[PDB]
């Protein structure tokens, strides 16, 4: 998988209400309100369960307990991939690199971290 440009600081993100924010300024509320406004999308907590920094070069595999039942989910993203932890900004498997490429305040992604994900409903 390749890195997405939008995480780059100074990037402007269009919210639910058409409002414009720079990626480095997005807070939690911004996602919540943005979701409560959208009639299509819904927010879903994706607590981390396992970070088996796995397989190949600099990539990682993360498992989440999604849904109100703790569905066992998996994902495969580069270690520097950012996650928006509830009320604690972004986080990652390699905070140092994340914060090098995108120049964003990256906390260490640990098990237990309740993340933000989207889904339809």
């Amino acid at each position: 998988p390749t890195l997405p440009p939008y995480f780059m600081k100074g990037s402007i993100i269009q919210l639910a209400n058409g409002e414009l924010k720079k990626v480095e300024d997005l807070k939690t509320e911004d996602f919540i309100q943005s979701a409560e406004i959208s009639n299509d999308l819904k927010i879903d907590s994706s607590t981390v369960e396992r970070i088996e920094d796995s397989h190949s070069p600099g990539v990682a595999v993360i498992q989440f307990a999604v849904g109100e039942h703790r569905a066992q989910v998996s994902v495969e993203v580069l270690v520097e991939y950012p996650f928006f932890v509830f009320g604690q900004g972004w986080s990652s498997c390699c905070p140092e690199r994340t914060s090098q490429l995108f120049d964003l305040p990256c906390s260490k992604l640990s098990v237990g971290d309740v993340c933000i994900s989207l889904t339809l409903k």
Partner: peptide, 25 residues
């Protein structure tokens, strides 16, 4: 006094919030 009629805008490449987060499904 005069209103600014022929005012061209500035184009800014923007990104959708929903794109910055993993979509589950």
């Amino acid at each position: 006094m005069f209103v600014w009629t022929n005012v061209e805008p500035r184009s800014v490449a923007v990104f959708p919030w929903h794109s910055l987060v993993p979509f589950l499904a």
